[PDB]
Every structure is written in structure tokens, then in C-alpha cells.
Design a protein around this ligand. Structure first.
Ligand SMILES: [Mg+2]
Ligand SMILES: [Mg+2]
Ligand SMILES: [Mg+2]
Ligand SMILES: [Mg+2]
Ligand SMILES: [Mg+2]
Ligand SMILES: [Mg+2]
Ligand SMILES: [Mg+2]
Ligand SMILES: [Mg+2]
Ligand SMILES: [Mg+2]
Ligand SMILES: [Mg+2]
Ligand SMILES: [Mg+2]
Ligand SMILES: [Zn+2]
Lengths: 165, 36, 142, 206
RNA sequence: UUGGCACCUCGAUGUCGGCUCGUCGCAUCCUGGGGCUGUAGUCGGUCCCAAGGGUUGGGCUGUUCGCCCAUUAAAGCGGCAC
RNA sequence: GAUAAACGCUGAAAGCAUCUAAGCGUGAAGCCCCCCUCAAGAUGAGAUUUCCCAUUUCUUCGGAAAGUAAGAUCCCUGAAA
């Protein structure tokens, strides 16, 4: 784990606080797994070698990496609305999709995550917390998920939908 | 979902996994979804 | 003949405060049931009550090994048809921890009038604070 | 969330502006006085204690006279608490007039139902009679006490017993008219109780 | 269920159906949630979760059962000395 | 509010993948609240407000007896019971 420039990390028990330009993260890890802060490089240390630890050991480097990468450059999950009359409007902060329902469906962007729409037929969830970016995009997709017959619905960017008659 | 005692790959895209201590096969072909 | 028998009030009942933080629900309970029944005193008389008072603090931090937090079910029947209610040990540790330890310990006391007296000597607290400072309770280790 | 105590005077009917004819209970609520404010610090919950109609001195005792004294009021026939209300509104010894309610306001009337005395299962539990003819000797009887296996009768086997005189809450009664000079509410429909019954009118929980 | 056995009861455990009153199980009839579908849509099918509530008036048959008329969201299957 | 089945996100063990092992989310007429009623014999007998006061006699301290206080009842007129 190589900390990019401008980024800072602190360890006050078993939790790590990764504060950078784009945001500020906190995450409580497993005490058993020991983390080492250096000037520009982080190293996660495994104590024993059981099925319990080996798993945690990996999860930590990955989440810690996902906390650092997330505050540096950030994360974008880009969604497409395919289908006639399926458009997306952002009228303030609330995302607003017309997606075939008799009512429109609106999404208030969670704290730290930022929705925006270049075109009416694509949505981009932006944030730092890859977890939170993941759970907003999922929820937006889950409004009208891709149906297999025509391909209508909200899909992720490079997603394979199965097709039928 | 086929829920049955005998959970086996039906094609070669079928994969056998475990979730919550249940054996299951997942597959591109949704007819092949099985849970034990 | 000559075997000593404790008389009521004869033996000095002491107040003990036991921190439950991270001890198995049983394991805590079996030790306390012994202290209440007065089995740790040579003056132990099976028909009297020579045992001590016990204050348990931090019962919200009592330990449940394995999946007991979700899988240990506590049942109550009202005695109306279909009147069986259930609570998980985890839900009960969060909301009524006082009740969790009381149930646990009430099962390890004798099932008689004396056992019902013993249970009155038990004082369980979710948090770290009690209002029994006036009884000058002594810390006890398991 | 407002409240007030009154006596059920009786029922009648009124013509709406529309022209429709609705049935109404008349509730006379003169002499409501705030007697006590209960707080989370002192009692453990928020409530306001309201005393209703004035009672002759000889019908009160020193404990009563000493409790109303605090509100500088004569003793009261009925004293009830109202929870779920703003204690900032209400001062000790203040009048509670029926003007706390407007027209169109939606209330919940609480009171004790009329006493029927010892009743049987046909009237008390709405059970079916047995046949009256075809040789039947089974008319107004409660039916099997239950199966054989338990060697006992389950709880809630409904049987004859004293029937009315229970606290009942009718919910979502519209107030139709409010007359301050006569201290009267007209509530649409009927409320529990005999004429002269104490009725507790609070803003509808729903 | 049809049976097998003969262990309690022959100084009596005295009766099928209906009526009255229910209560319980879930192997779910309806209503709720979901997976698959020979899921375009509609109307369906099937499996998983689910027992909160609901689950009918007649004609014929002593009839349980059944058949029929007319309804219903549905007219569930069992246990409780059938 | 927490869940079932289920759908996911993040995610290693197992450089990939993976709803799962750590960790988040969504999700039933069901579960717990919410709504109605009973409810401190809840002997674990709870709380608040108000009232009465610390009398007399003998008694080994223990306690006993007697008139009372606030208050309740008997009795009487009754019903909305
Ligand atoms: Mg009457
Ligand atoms: Mg009838
Ligand atoms: Mg007759
Ligand atoms: Mg029995
Ligand atoms: Mg033989
Ligand atoms: Mg005999
Ligand atoms: Mg089932
Ligand atoms: Mg017939
Ligand atoms: Mg029978
Ligand atoms: Mg993944
Ligand atoms: Mg939820
Ligand atoms: Zn397959």
C-alpha cells in the first residue's frame, strides 16, 4: 500500500482514519491483525496462519487500499437508462428518473456521495467510499433492473444482460 | 430456484458454491440455479 | 449428635459486586448461584441461607459463545391457547440484560421456597452503576 | 394534542350547511381546571392533570381540598391525566375551555360503557342459539367447553358474566359545533356511557 | 387410511352424522413477499418464505363423502377419545 | 424497528472470481413496537400530589392496652349500578 501525496493516515487502537483531499474515512478493523504506518508505505501484518486470519489479512489490505485510493482519485459507477421515455433529470440534489412507473422515482444523494447526469439517458454516482458508491448505484439500478426481452431498464456501463423472445 | 437434496452442475457453466452453509449451484442459465 | 447447623442471621451475609464483562452467561451464573447458596462457606447449612448478596454490573457485556446471540430462544407461555412468546438471547441481552442473567441464574438455584429467597439476594445492572453503595459491596473475582 | 373532560348530556341531531342531517352527542364541559403538571424529572412521564365539575365542600375531604388549593380552585368531581400534550401550554389553575377544539377537528371519546348486569353468551359474546324447535333442549347455552384431551377448559372459553361498565375509546369522531357561552361540544355520532357519564375528549392519536 | 397385535378399560372408557363452541399443526385454499418459467403482454404454472386474519348459502343423499345450483379473494388439508 | 425467503454492495480465504468468512444495504398480511383493554398479590407489592400527626395509660427493654387524628364504615334515601 503506497500512500499518494496529500493523503494522511492515523491508527488510534484497531480503527484507521484515512483523510485526503476528496473526503475523510474511518473504519474499525479486527484487533488481531496489526497494521504498520511508514512515511509513504503501509504494510498489514498477519499474526498466525489459520482460516480465520488469512481471510482478515487480505480483507484489511484491500479495504485499507480502498480507503486510500477512494480519498485520492475517487470512484465512479456509471449507469445507462435504455428504453422509450426512460430519462433521468436532476432537479436540485434529488435524482429523478422516469422509468415507466405511473409516478417518478427520486433519490436524495447520501452524505459523501454525489449523483450527476451528463445526458438524460445515463447517470453517474461519484463518491470516495467505494462501499457507499456501490450501494447507491445498486439501489438506483434496483428501481427498474434490466429486463431480458427488449433490454429495457437501468444497467451498469459494461454489464452483460441475458436476452430472450 | 430449484430447491432439492441433490444439487449438481447441469451444464459446465454451472458452479457449486456455499452461502450460509447451504450448497448451491449458480449459472448464467437461471434454470440451473439450485439450492440444497 | 454434634454436626454444626447455622441459625438464621448467625452467619455474616456479605455484599459482592461481580463485573460480568466478557464472561460466558453460564460460567458467570454457576459461580453466582454457588455464592448465593453459600456453598463457599464452611458454615453452609442446606436448610438456612448462609450465602452472600451479589450485585452483577455490566450485564449488557455478558458473553454468548457461538450463535447463542441469535439461536438461544427464551420462551414464555401466558397459559392462553397459542400464548407462546419467544425472545432471542441477543435481543434480550441488548434490551433486558437484567432479565437475561436473572433467568440464567434462577435455573441454577434450588426450585423451592429457599431458592426463591436466594434469588431476592441477586441485583443485576445493564451498566456499571448500582445504588447499593450503602451496603459497602466488595469486588469479587471468578 | 388538546383534551377536555365533560358529561354526556344526551344525543340529538343538527342540519349541516350542505343540508344533510347528522346525529350528535352533546358534551357539556364547564369548569375544567389544570390541577397538576407531571414532568419526567418529578414523576417520570409528561402529563397534565385536569379537574372537571365543582363538588360541594362536604363531598370533598382534606386530602382533596389540599390538592386543588395548589391550583386556587374548589374541589372537582373528576380528575384525569392527559399524556402526549405540550406542558408549555397549560398553567396550574388555568381554565380549559371547549374553544381548544374547532369545527372539523377529529377527537377520540373515552368513557365507561353502560352497565348491563349479569349477561349470557348470546348478548355478551354474540354467540348463536341452539335450535328453538325440532326437539332441541339447547337454546341460549355457551356450547362445548372444549375437547377431552386437556382434562381442563382453556382460558378465554367465553361464558356468562357481568357485561358493560368497561372503559371504551371511540376514535375519529368529528366535532360539529363548539358553543363557549354554554361550554358545549357537539361530537358527530355517539360516545360510550349513560346520560351524565364522564367523557374524556382528546385529539385523535391517528 | 386399510390392516396386524390383544397391552389399559367387560363390579360399563355407553353411541355414527348434525348442532353449539372452538383450539392446534402446516404438508398454504385466499390474501403478503420472492426464485424459476414453455416469464413479450394479459391470464397462468411451479417452487421457496409465510399460520396474521379470512376461508358460503342452497338442492339431492340418514349419509361422512359425494354430485349438483348459485356465489366467493378463497370456498385448504389434518389433529384434539374419527 | 428488526428479520424470512430473496436481491445486492464491499470483500478476502484462493493476486482472479465470489451476497460471506470480517463488514454494510434492501426486503413479507409474519416478529417487536405503534392502536384498544386489563394490569403493582409485578409479595420484584412501584411513582407523584395532598391530608393527619408524633397523644394517654401502664410495661422488664421487647412491646401490650385505650381513647383519637386524617379518613372510612354501619344505618338510611336511592340509580346512571
Ligand atoms: Mg343499568
Ligand atoms: Mg343459527
Ligand atoms: Mg326449549
Ligand atoms: Mg394436565
Ligand atoms: Mg400374549
Ligand atoms: Mg368402577
Ligand atoms: Mg411451510
Ligand atoms: Mg343435507
Ligand atoms: Mg368423536
Ligand atoms: Mg463482488
Ligand atoms: Mg429495513
Ligand atoms: Zn448451468
Amino acid at each position: 500500500i503506497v500512500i499518494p501525496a496529500g493523503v494522511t493516515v492515523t491508527l488510534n487502537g484497531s480503527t484507521a482514519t484515512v483523510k485526503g483531499p476528496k473526503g475523510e474515512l474511518v473504519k474499525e478493523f479486527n484487533p488481531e491483525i496489526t497494521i504498520k504506518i511508514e512515511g509513504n508505505e503501509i504494510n498489514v501484518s498477519r499474526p498466525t496462519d489459520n482460516k480465520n486470519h488469512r481471510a482478515l489479512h487480505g480483507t484489511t489490505r484491500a479495504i485499507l487500499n480502498n480507503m486510500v485510493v477512494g480519498v485520492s482519485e475517487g470512484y465512479e459507477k456509471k449507469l445507462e437508462l435504455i428504453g422509450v421515455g426512460y430519462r433521468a433529470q436532476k432537479q436540485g440534489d434529488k435524482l429523478v428518473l422516469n422509468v415507466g412507473y405511473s409516478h417518478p422515482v427520486e433519490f436524495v444523494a447520501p452524505k459523501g456521495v454525489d449523483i450527476e447526469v451528463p445526458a438524460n439517458t445515463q447517470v453517474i454516482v461519484k463518491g470516495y467510499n467505494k462501499e457507499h458508491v456501490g450501494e447507491l448505484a445498486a439501489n438506483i439500478r434496483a428501481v427498474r433492473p434490466p429486463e431480458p426481452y427488449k433490454g429495457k431498464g437501468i444497467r451498469y456501463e459494461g454489464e452483460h444482460v441475458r436476452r430472450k423472445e | 430456484m430449484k430447491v432439492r437434496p441433490s444439487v449438481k452442475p447441469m451444464c459446465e457453466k454451472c458452479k457449486v458454491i456455499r452461502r450460509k452453509g447451504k450448497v448451491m449451484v449458480i449459472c448464467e442459465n437461471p434454470k440451473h440455479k439450485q439450492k440444497q | 449428635r454434634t454436626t454444626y447447623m447455622a441459625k438464621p442471621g448467625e452467619v455474616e451475609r456479605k455484599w459482592y459486586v461481580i463485573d460480568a464483562t466478557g464472561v460466558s452467561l453460564g460460567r458467570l451464573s454457576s459461580e453466582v448461584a454457588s455464592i448465593l447458596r453459600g456453598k463457599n462457606k464452611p458454615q453452609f447449612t442446606p436448610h438456612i441461607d448462609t450465602g452472600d448478596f451479589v450485585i452483577i454490573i455490566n450485564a449488557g457485556k455478558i458473553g454468548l459463545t457461538g450463535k447463542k446471540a441469535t439461536d438461544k430462544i427464551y420462551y414464555r407461555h401466558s397459559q392462553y391457547p397459542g400464548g407462546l412468546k419467544s425472545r432471542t438471547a441477543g435481543e434480550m441481552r441488548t434490551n433486558n440484560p437484567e432479565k437475561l442473567l436473572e433467568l440464567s441464574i434462577k435455573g441454577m438455584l434450588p426450585k423451592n421456597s429457599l431458592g426463591r429467597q436466594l434469588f431476592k439476594k441477586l441485583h443485576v445492572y445493564g451498566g456499571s452503576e448500582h445504588e447499593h453503595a450503602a451496603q459497602q459491596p466488595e469486588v469479587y473475582e471468578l | 394534542t388538546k383534551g377536555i373532560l365533560g358529561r354526556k348530556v344526551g344525543m340529538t341531531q343538527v342540519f349541516t350547511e350542505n343540508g344533510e342531517l347528522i346525529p350528535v352527542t352533546v358534551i357539556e364541559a364547564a369548569q375544567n381546571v389544570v390541577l397538576q403538571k407531571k414532568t419526567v424529572e418529578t414523576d417520570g412521564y409528561e402529563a397534565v392533570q385536569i379537574g372537571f365539575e365543582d363538588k360541594r365542600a362536604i363531598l370533598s375531604n382534606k386530602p382533596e381540598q389540599g390538592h386543588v388549593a395548589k391550583a386556587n380552585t374548589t374541589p372537582k368531581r373528576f380528575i384525569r391525566e392527559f399524556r402526549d400534550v405540550n406542558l408549555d401550554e397549560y398553567e396550574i389553575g388555568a381554565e380549559v375551555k371547549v374553544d381548544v377544539f374547532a369545527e372539523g377537528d377529529i377527537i377520540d371519546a373515552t368513557g365507561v360503557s353502560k352497565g348491563k348486569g349479569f349477561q349470557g353468551v348470546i348478548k355478551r359474546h354474540g354467540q348463536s342459539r341452539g335450535p328453538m324447535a325440532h326437539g332441541s333442549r339447547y337454546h341460549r347455552r355457551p356450547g362445548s367447553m372444549g375437547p377431552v384431551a386437556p382434562n381442563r377448559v382453556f382460558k378465554n372459553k367465553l361464558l356468562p358474566g357481568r357485561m358493560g361498565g368497561e372503559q371504551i375509546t371511540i376514535q375519529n369522531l368529528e366535532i360539529v359545533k363548539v358553543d363557549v357561552e354554554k361550554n358545549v361540544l357537539l361530537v358527530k355520532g355517539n360516545v360510550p356511557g349513560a346520560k351524565k357519564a364522564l367523557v374524556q375528549i382528546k385529539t385523535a392519536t391517528k
